[PDB]
Structures are given as C-alpha cells and as structure tokens.
Symmetry: C3
C-alpha cells in the first residue's frame, strides 16, 4: 500500500530513506534560496503526495541544521494535502543561510494520529 | 473509538473543530483578547478542557498561515491525564505586533498516538 | 517490548513518567551548562536506548520552561539511534539560562509512526 508521489518539476528529488530505523524520509530543496539571519523562507520541494490514512506528515528538523540555528516552522502536512510540500526553514542563527537545489532540508515523518468525535459535557 | 469529552469553562470557549475529514488537527480558538509584541510569547487561554484519549497526547501544532507570518508554538504537550484549561503559547517571531482577538484560531490540536513502554536499565545494548 | 537503556556515566538519571497519564519520560542534564539569550546548546543526558519498533522518540518541551522562553531544537531520536541522547535547548528568553547537573530539561515521547513505501507516479 505505497504512498504515491508526483514531481511537479524535474528539479524535485524523490524523498530518500537510508536505514530501517530512520524516523522518516529526507526532503530536498527544488530551488536556490538565501535566508538572512532572523528571517524565514518557504522552501519548495516540488513533491506532492497522496498521504496515508489516519496519519499526518510532520516536517521535522535535521539535527545538523538545528545545531546551526536552523529551525522548522509550521510543518503539519495533512492527510488530504495534494499540493506542493513546503518546508519553512527558520534561520535563528547569526549568519545568512544558503539553500541550494538538491540540499537536504528536513525529514518527513508519517505520524500516526487519532480522529475522535468530540462531544461537550457539563463536567469531566 | 468513543468520543472525546470536553468542557467549555466559560461561554467564550469554542468547540475544537476539524476543518475537513482529512485534516490532521482540531482548531483551537482564543477565548480572550491579547496583544503580543515582537520577540515575545503569550499563554493564550482556550477555556477548553478535555478528557484526553488513551495512549495519546494532544500536540498543540501551528497553523501554516501564522507560521509564515512568524508565529510559532511553544510547549504544546497536552498529557492524557491533563484536566485543566488548555493553553497555547504563541511566540511572535515576526517584526510587528501580533493581535489576538477572541474567537481567532491560534493553533491546531493533533491527537498523536504514543507508547508507554517500561524502561529497563542495562549494562550494554 | 521494554526499552533497554544505558547510563554512559553515573551522572545520568533514569528517565521516568511523572504520572500514568503523562506523555513523556523526563530527561535530565548530566552536566552543567550556561545558555546566553538568543543562543542554543546541545545538552547531554548520558542515556542511550534501544528504541521501540515503528516509533521515534521526540524531544519535547517542558511547559514551565517554555513559558520562560526555553524551546527545543532538533529532537528527532530515530529508532536505530544507539548514541548519547542530546537535548537542544534554545534560550529565546531575555536573560542567561542556567542548567545544573540533574536538572529536568525536556521529556521524551515515544511517538508511533508509519514506514510506508514510496512510488513515483505521473498523477495522484
Ligand atoms: O510547513 C508547512 C505547513 C503546511 N503545509 C501545507 C500542508 C497543509 O495541509 C497546508 C495548510 O494550508 P492552509 O489551508 O493555509 O491551512 P492553515 O489554516 O493551517 O494555514 O499547507 C506545508 O506544505 N508546509
Ligand atoms: O503549551 C502548553 C503546554 C502544557 N499545557 C498543559 C497541559 C499539560 O498536561 C500540562 C503540563 O504541566 P506540568 O506537567 O505541570 O508542567 P511541566 O511540563 O513543566 O512539567 O500543562 C498547556 O495547556 N499548554
Ligand atoms: O536533538 C537531537 C537530535 C538528534 N539526535 C540524535 C538522534 C538522531 O537519530 C541522530 C541524527 O543525527 P544525524 O542523522 O547524524 O544528523 P542529521 O539529522 O543532520 O542527518 O542524532 C539527538 O540526540 N538529539
Ligand atoms: Cl510531533
Ligand atoms: Mg511534568
């Protein structure tokens, strides 16, 4: 029951998985960007996916980048999202951060979730 | 399986809603009026408490639109046994003042499935 | 499956849950640290684990610390990570943040995940 994906352009890199115990799948920039210190930038992957059921894709940080002051904004890829998967990279470092086409920028993690019906009660 | 029971602590609370059947989270709304200056954070009251589902926690997750504006989320771990008012730590990492009005959607609650394994201390792995 | 864990030094403290309904197992600093405002620090726990299957450990924030402007960077502990677990504390407060050996600094949540196959298609 694979996750089907589409490359919007030929600049997209098929998300990679390196080991059996990796949390997710590597995501790559499809374009060149420059992020000044204290600013953030939406990074296009040019990948779209028909996501698994009862799951969401978490855009989660890479460890090396996190140590360089690069943090992740937003990051909730809904199961019903069929659009371009974007990575919001936040530069909380002191220097400019460059993003080149084909650079690893994040990992996508398919996180199992629950969809309960909610009902209001008088007390818990 | 069974419904998640919640309580509106005041008439200002708004029921957490999922925008679509393929949406990850349930909308959380501000129950009060706030101003958040740049470089600051604010505990936003939802006035909602809930009896959380088993083997799960509620993640307070960011909205995409607010994240692009510089609004990030602090904390965010709503324990299964938490019975108090759910609060949202909104961080203003934008350049300008961020206004929060009553009824504004500020975050999304994701019911994330988890494990509670027993931990055993060994000498080698 | 029980999670097997190792203390690298006697400075390490066993991760525990504060209650039967707590999401996270508390993580503690095994050393003294000082984090300036607007800076981050990788914190050693001196704890290694054989992580459970179809899971990753999320380094998640403590709530009181988050109110003080202490955030978590990185924080993805892969299922096949067998090394020292490090917490990246980001001091987004206005004053210096002190970490003393033994201080509770984060919580580890064992988050259930999916490892699906990926297949490229022309259209979803
Ligand atoms: O970092 C992110 C966050 C979200 N999305 C996508 C997936 C998600 O399903 C959609 C959310 O868009 P929206 O309709 O603007 O929702 P919101 O109300 O959260 O802004 O955008 C991304 O690609 N990257
Ligand atoms: O952003 C947050 C973070 C936490 N909490 C609530 C839910 C959670 O179950 C409780 C945790 O409180 P604690 O265990 O007393 O604090 P700490 O995390 O510092 O141990 O506070 C919120 O409402 N919003
Ligand atoms: O806050 C963190 C983040 C990561 N790691 C560990 C666990 C993870 O499995 C490993 C990943 O390191 P990497 O793969 O070498 O770095 P990157 O993610 O940049 O490829 O480092 C930590 O201990 N703490
Ligand atoms: Cl998460
Ligand atoms: Mg606690």
């Amino acid at each position: 029951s694979p996750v089907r994906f589409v490359k919007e352009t030929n600049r997209a890199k098929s998300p990679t998985r390196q080991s059996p115990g990796a949390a997710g799948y590597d995501l790559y920039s499809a374009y060149d960007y420059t992020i000044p210190p204290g600013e953030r930038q939406l990074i296009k992957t040019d990948i779209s996916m028909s996501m698994p059921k009862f799951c969401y894709g978490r855009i989660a940080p890479r460890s090396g980048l996190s140590l360089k002051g690069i943090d992740i904004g937003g990051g909730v890829i809904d199961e019903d999202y069929r659009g371009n998967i974007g990575v919001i990279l936040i530069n909380n470092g002191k220097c400019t951060f460059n993003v080149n086409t084909g650079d690893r920028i994040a990992q996508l993690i398919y996180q199992r979730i629950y969809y309960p019906e909610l009902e209001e009660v008088q007390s818990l």
